[PDB]
Amino acid sequence: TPATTXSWTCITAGVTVXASLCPXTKCXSRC
């Protein structure tokens, strides 16, 4: 796995948590 320096993996994994609680996350962002 050519996972250089925090690529897609780092992106998706982190994004997911924020959109979980992070304010503004359920306001149409996921609904």
Task: Please state how this structure was obtained.
Answer: NMR
* Interatomic CA distance for residues 10 and 22, integer angstroms: 17
CB 18, CB 25: distance < 8 Å: yes
Residues 6+ positions from 25 with CB-CB distance below 8 Å: 18, 19
CB 10, CB 4: distance < 8 Å: no
